[PDB]
Amino acid sequence: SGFRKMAFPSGKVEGCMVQVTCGTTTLNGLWLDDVVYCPRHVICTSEDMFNPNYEDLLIRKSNHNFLVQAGNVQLRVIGHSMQNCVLKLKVDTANPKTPKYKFVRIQPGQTFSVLACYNGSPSGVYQCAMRPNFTIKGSFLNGSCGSVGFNIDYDCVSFCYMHHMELPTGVHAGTDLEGNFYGPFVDRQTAQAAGTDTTITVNVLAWLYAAVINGDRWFLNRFTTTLNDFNLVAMKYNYEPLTQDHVDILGPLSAQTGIAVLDMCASLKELLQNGMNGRTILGSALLEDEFTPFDVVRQCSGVTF
């Protein structure tokens, strides 16, 4: 028992991290089969970062201007293209540590692991959620661009995130691995703000199930509610509306604990309206929304990869 913010084992990804240098810029890259993926702003200087013409910038570059290093192995670049906001460098050697993998675009509210890297060197691993507003609340310093997020299912790594920038508010924005930004952001230094965020209701409920499974049960009450009534409360407190699809996804946890989803919604309504009273749930003084229902069952079952 116990409940932690747990990340996937990062080994399969550590072996894909390389250092990509173009001119003065060095940042991180992802080496899979014979292709290296990195943020296309690798080709930018300080100026022209306020309205970079990436086509015109990429045209001044040749295969030999892109230095790719994996450890001290120097890769030979034989092609280069740009796809959306990602640069794709074709190299003459297939990465011998390429795991089984696919590229996936994740939905808001889903979670993934981040392997923060600097100069192509892995530094730390942590878990986090795509916010409803398509930001992530990361921990990233200058030089972390090209770090990636991922999920792992048995032996298959699903890459879903590559890190591109930090907004003036300290939150983070990036692309899927086809280079398409999550949310409204562009890779220019212009004034761009994230939309209104919200709390991930279905994740908050999965976490209350996780709390009951571990014995943190003081918040259960003898009330119940309706989807409609609960969604009234969710809107007052800036919670995502709860749908029938969310209820269904909570079905397994409902069956394991014997607590109906609408009953757990009545617990959550009581907590939103009255706060926690200085008590704690699974070691937290606030409602956590960065565990999906899948995360709760994985960690309350003992699943391996």
Ligand X SMILES: Cn1cc(-c2cc(-c3cc(Cl)c(F)c(OCc4ccccc4Cl)c3)c(=O)n(-c3cccnc3)c2)c(=O)[nH]c1=O
Select 19 or 225, whichever has its Cβ closest to ligand X: 19
How many other β-carbons are positioned within 10 Å of the β-carbon of residue 131?
23
Select 52 or 120, whichever has its Cβ closest to its own copies: 120
Select 190 or 280, whichever has its Cβ closest to ligand X: 190
Per CB under 8 A, the list member of 121, 221, 226, 238 interacting with its own copies is 121
Per the annotation, the verdict on 80 as an active-site residue is no
Instruction: Please state, in angstroms and rounded to a whole number, the distance separating the CA atoms of residues 14 and 207.
Output: 30
Q: Does 304 bind its own copies (CB under 8 A)?
A: yes
Handedness of CA 157, 158, 163, 167 (dihedral sign): negative
Instruction: Please state, in angstroms and rounded to a whole number, the distance separating the CA atoms of residues 125 and 111.
Output: 13
Q: Read off the tokens for 53.
A: 């013409």
Residue pair 141/45 in contact (Cβ under 8 Å)? The answer is: no
Q: Does 117 bind its own copies (CB under 8 A)?
A: yes
Residues of this chain that interact with ligand X (CB under 6 A) are: 25-27, 41, 49, 140-145, 164-168, 187-190, 192
Q: Would you list the DSSP string of 88-102?
A: EEEESS--TTPPEEE
Q: How far is the CB of 193 from ligand X (least distance, A)?
A: 8
Select 166 or 197, whichever has its Cβ closest to ligand X: 166
Residue 281 DSSP one-character state? B
Active-site residue, from 22, 41, 160, 300? 41
Active-site residue, from 145, 160, 265, 300? 145
Per the annotation, the verdict on 145 as an active-site residue is yes
Nearest to 66 by CA among 32, 96, 36: 36
How many other β-carbons are positioned within 10 Å of the β-carbon of residue 53?
9
Q: How far is the CB of 178 from its own copies (least distance, A)?
A: 25
Interface positions with its own copies (CB under 8 A): 1-11, 14-15, 115-119, 121-126, 128, 137-144, 166, 170-172, 214-215, 275-276, 278, 280, 283-286, 298-305
Among all residues, which ones are annotated catalytic?
41, 145
